[PDB]
Amino acid sequence: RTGYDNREIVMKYIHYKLSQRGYEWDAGSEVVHLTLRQAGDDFSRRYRRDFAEMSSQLHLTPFTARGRFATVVEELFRDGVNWGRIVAFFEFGGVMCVESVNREMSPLVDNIALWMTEYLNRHLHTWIQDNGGWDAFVELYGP
Ligand SMILES: O=C(NS(=O)(=O)c1ccc(NC2CCOCC2)c([N+](=O)[O-])c1)c1ccc(N2CCN(CC3=C(c4ccc(Cl)cc4)CCOC3)CC2)cc1
């Protein structure tokens, strides 16, 4: 119906975060993916302390990742949604994927991509559509 699939925004974002570390191949039209990447890179520069704390406190394992993902996301959106919190959600998913590869649990990346897609589709999609859609995010933060 929308003409797009949020799974693609998730897959492209995770691919970019892994590629930045040399964890996935990338030699280095659509504007949403570039806008989101840039916003997330800036978010992690501004909130470097929160990023470093999140990157060392996760202690991810295959049985604990699901619960940790849900708990952090619930904390993130407890006071409501805005674009910055959506950018923070992608950055959090990125940290979970990078940590999963670091801990030799690369298959978890596919599960994290599914949980992010499901949360965007079921819990954030209404807010996004009510707030001008991805079009409004690009109008505010895009080139
Ligand atoms: O300002 C905000 N929102 S905004 O006004 O919508 C807005 C403004 C400007 C711009 N972009 C800028 C425009 C000017 O040029 C440069 C770009 C955009 N944007 O979308 O691009 C949107 C805003 C600020 C901070 C914020 N977080 C919330 C999360 N928290 C830590 C935390 C968790 C957490 C910890 C680590 C990691 Cl990796 C992830 C999550 C998980 C558990 O919970 C706590 C840290 C602070 C949320 C929203």
Could you please describe the fold and organization of this structure?
The radius of gyration is 15 Å and the shape is globular. It contains seven helices and no strands. The protein has one domain. The chain starts with 5 loop residues before the first helix and ends with a helix. The chain has helices spanning 6-20, 32-46, 48-57, 65-76, 83-102, 108-130, 133-141. The longest helix has 23 residues, at 108-130. With 143 residues, the protein is an all-alpha fold. The site of ligand 1XV has 19 residues, from helix 2, helix 3, helix 4 and helix 5. Belongs to the Bcl-2 family. Its main location: mitochondrion. A motif (BH3) lies at residues 32-46. A motif (BH4) lies at residues 5-25. This is Apoptosis regulator Bcl-2.
Summary tags:
143 residues, 7 helices, binds the ligand O=C(NS(=O)(=O)c1ccc(NC2CCOCC2)c([N+](=O)[O-])c1)c1ccc(N2CCN(CC3=C(c4ccc(Cl)cc4)CCOC3)CC2)cc1, DNA-binding transcription factor binding, autophagy, channel inhibitor activity, nucleus
Question: What sequence of helices (H) and strands (E) makes up the elements?
Answer: HHHHHHH
Fraction in helix = over 70%
- What profile does the largest beta sheet have? none
Structural class: mainly alpha
Question: Which ligands are bound?
Answer: the ligand O=C(NS(=O)(=O)c1ccc(NC2CCOCC2)c([N+](=O)[O-])c1)c1ccc(N2CCN(CC3=C(c4ccc(Cl)cc4)CCOC3)CC2)cc1
What is the alpha-carbon Rg in Å? 15 Å
Strand content: under 5%
Q: Estimate the global geometry from the Cα principal axes.
A: globular
What number of domains? 1
C-alpha end-to-end distance: 27 Å
How many strands appear in the DSSP assignment?
0
Q: Count of helical segments?
A: 7
